[PDB]
Amino acid sequence: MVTAKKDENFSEWYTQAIVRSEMIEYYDISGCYIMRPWAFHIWEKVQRFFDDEIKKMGVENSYFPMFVSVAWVTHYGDSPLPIAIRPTSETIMYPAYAKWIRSHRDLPLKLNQWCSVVRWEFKQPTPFLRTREFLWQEGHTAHATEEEAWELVLDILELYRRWYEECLAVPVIKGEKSEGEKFAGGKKTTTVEAFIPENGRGIQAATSHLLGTNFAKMFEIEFEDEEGHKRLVHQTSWGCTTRSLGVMIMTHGDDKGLVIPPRVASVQVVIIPILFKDENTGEILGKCRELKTMLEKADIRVRIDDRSNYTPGWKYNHWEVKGVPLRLELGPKDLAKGTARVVRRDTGEAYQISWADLAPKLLELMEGIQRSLFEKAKARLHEGIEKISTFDEVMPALNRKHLVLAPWCEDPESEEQIKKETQKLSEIQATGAMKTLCIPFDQPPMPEGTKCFYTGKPAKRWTLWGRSY
């Protein structure tokens, strides 16, 4: 049972929740975490969704080696050798792209791979959020024109919005990264950002880069034109990781533990026979089995927790901590009345449902839960953003654990200065630096001559700032 309370002791709540739900297991190498089925199934679900969608775009999967020509591999079982793990595979894939692309009809080229990457940062580790090894997908495409590459950047970003909002019920904000926060060596980075109210931090949910021609020039990825001229390809890359699971956990969880959106939950309905220690005669479990078969006919994912020793209250708490969206209780009166009691995890509301009506009503409830989780989260996102005009509004907003939307001149040195000055102010108040999250695609109007909230120069666009992961 989760005993830390989410808003009072958030990091402790997160650690308790992810372990007591059986999502992760600890490991004797720092920064590495076992993904148990309760978490991994969620990965399987968003992976299937995204993979189906990119295949509709003509992206095809592949596998490139994990060794880059540095985590050095010096020996093979104490036989020394005469290596380097991928943090990301641009340098692994792009020589191959230079080889594969010769003329305009070789384009576009669109590849994806699902794999794990290793990033051995010294800083402190947190499961799903920032780890030594994590799973992701990385897509890399090359196009004859910049317009086509940018169109794909935006299509992928929309797919990421759907990954978060339709699968995980997490609202995100589409936007463009500042010059200082864009991918190294690219033209323009787009992103979807999420918000964590309990610590007021923005977090990058996924990222989709217009690399432009810089990588082509560096790796000599050229193609011959239709008129016979050598031209550089225009490239993109885009990635999204198991950090999505962390965001989902933080968005929907409450004081009792996780809440898993029905669309991705490994079990959608747990059937809990109200049986005590020697009560097994087959009457309750039989109807439990019948109900499982019926519900599975409607493509509902069901488990019966028929484990001998635990009380019904133990099982209720166990499955609430895991965050299964619906619980179906079947005990003796239920059996004698022909009904079952269903409790939905997000609100605790209970329904007495006739056995005939179970599969429809549950489908209904699941849609309700999934929509409600999104709408409540979207409302919290909206209540977490203060639209300001001047710098004196910044520190107050940050102390309410909010982000700010402010008019900005988009000068990069100004972003560095704002980082340093908000860090300074935070230490004197006693990680406190505030930085840009994105420049949202949805731009409110910019009245003529609006001043940048920090520099006083002419503002160019509304920019989203906050403390960050």
Ligand X SMILES: COc1cncc(-c2cc(F)cc(CNC(=O)c3cc(N4CC[C@@](C#N)(C5CC5)C4=O)cc(C)n3)c2)c1
Binding site for Ca(2+), residues? 151, 155
The CA distances from residue 395 to 53, 427, 455, 463, in Å, are 42, 12, 16, 16
93 in Cβ contact with 140 (< 8 Å): yes
Beta carbon nearer to ligand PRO, 185 or 286: 185
Q: Does 108 bind ligand X (CB under 6 A)?
A: no
What is the SS3 assignment for 428?
A: helix
> Helix 283-297 crosses helix 358-383 at what angle (to 10 degrees)?
70
Part of the chain binding ligand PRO (CB under 6 A), chosen from 234-242, 245-253, 320-328, 433-441: 234-242
The site for a second copy, by CB under 8 A, has a size of 59
Beta carbon nearer to Cl ion, 11 or 280: 11
CB of 215 to ligand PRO, least distance (A): 11
Alpha helix positions (H), 264-352: 283-297, 312-322, 332-337
250 Cα distance to chain centroid: 10
Part of the chain binding ligand X (CB under 6 A), chosen from 203-211, 269-277, 362-370, 385-393: 203-211
What is the SS3 assignment for 378?
A: helix
Q: Looking only at residues 210 through 269 of this chain, which bind a second copy when binding is defined by CB under 8 A?
A: 266
Q: Does 207 bind ligand X (CB under 6 A)?
A: yes
Q: Which residues of 305-314 are buried (b: 16+ CB within 10 A; e: fewer)?
A: beeeebeeee
DSSP code, position 78:
S
370 Cα distance to chain centroid: 16
Q: Does 443 bind Cl ion (CB under 5 A)?
A: no
Q: Which residue in 14, 164, 223, 316 binds Cl ion (CB under 5 A)? A: 14
210 in Cβ contact with 187 (< 8 Å): yes
Alpha-carbon span 139 to 237, nearest angstrom: 5
Partner whose binding site includes residue 278, from a second copy, ligand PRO, ligand X, none (CB under 5 to 8 Å by kind): none
Beta carbon nearer to a second copy, 307 or 442: 307
Q: Does 11 bind Cl ion (CB under 5 A)?
A: yes
Beta carbon nearer to a second copy, 79 or 281: 79
In order, the DSSP letters of 166-195 are IIS----EEEE--GGGSPTT-SEEEEEEEE
Establish how many alpha carbons lie within 13 A of residue 435's alpha carbon, considering only the half-sphere containing its beta carbon: 20
Part of the chain binding a second copy (CB under 8 A), chosen from 8-16, 175-183, 308-316, 451-459: 308-316
Partner whose binding site includes residue 183, from ligand X, ligand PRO, Cl ion, none (CB under 5 to 8 Å by kind): ligand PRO
Part of the chain binding ligand X (CB under 6 A), chosen from 224-232, 236-244, 311-319, 363-371: 236-244
Q: Does 191 bind ligand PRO (CB under 6 A)?
A: no
Beta carbon nearer to Cl ion, 198 or 329: 198
Beta carbon nearer to ligand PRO, 138 or 329: 138
DSSP code, position 242:
T
Give residue 200's region: left, alpha or beta (phi > 0; psi -120 to 50).
left
394 in Cβ contact with 404 (< 8 Å): yes
Q: For the chain, how far is it from start to end, CA to CA, in angstroms? A: 27
Tokens matching residue 87: 């943090």
Q: Does 309 bind a second copy (CB under 8 A)?
A: yes
Q: Does 419 bind ligand X (CB under 6 A)?
A: no
Q: Does 125 bind ligand X (CB under 6 A)?
A: yes
Beta carbon nearer to a second copy, 53 or 411: 53
Partner whose binding site includes residue 238, from a second copy, ligand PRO, ligand X, none (CB under 5 to 8 Å by kind): ligand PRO
Q: Does 40 bind a second copy (CB under 8 A)?
A: yes
Q: Does 102 bind a second copy (CB under 8 A)?
A: no
Tokens matching residue 280: 């097994």
Angle 56-164-146 from CA coordinates, rounded to 5°: 50
Q: Looking only at residues 131 through 170 of this chain, which bind ligand X when binding is defined by CB under 6 A?
A: 131-132, 134, 136
- What residues form DSSP beta bridges with 137? 114, 240
What is the SS3 assignment for 362?
A: helix
Q: What backbone phi and psi angles, to 5 degrees, belong to 449?
A: 80, 15
Partner whose binding site includes residue 81, from Cl ion, ligand X, a second copy, none (CB under 5 to 8 Å by kind): a second copy
Beta strands in 276-431 (DSSP E): 302-304, 326-330, 339-344, 350-354, 385-387, 403-408
Beta carbon nearer to Cl ion, 113 or 131: 131
Q: Does 239 bind ligand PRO (CB under 6 A)?
A: yes
Tokens matching residue 273: 């026979």
The site for Cl ion, by CB under 5 A, has a size of 2
Partner whose binding site includes residue 75, from a second copy, ligand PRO, Cl ion, none (CB under 5 to 8 Å by kind): a second copy
Q: Interface residues with a second copy (CB under 8 A)?
A: 25, 27-29, 32-37, 40-41, 43-44, 60-79, 81, 83, 85, 95-96, 99-100, 103-105, 111, 115-116, 118, 120-122, 132-133, 135, 266, 307-310
Q: Interface residues with ligand X (CB under 6 A)?
A: 31, 119, 121, 123-125, 130-132, 134, 136, 204-207, 239-241, 243
Q: Interface residues with Cl ion (CB under 5 A)?
A: 11, 14
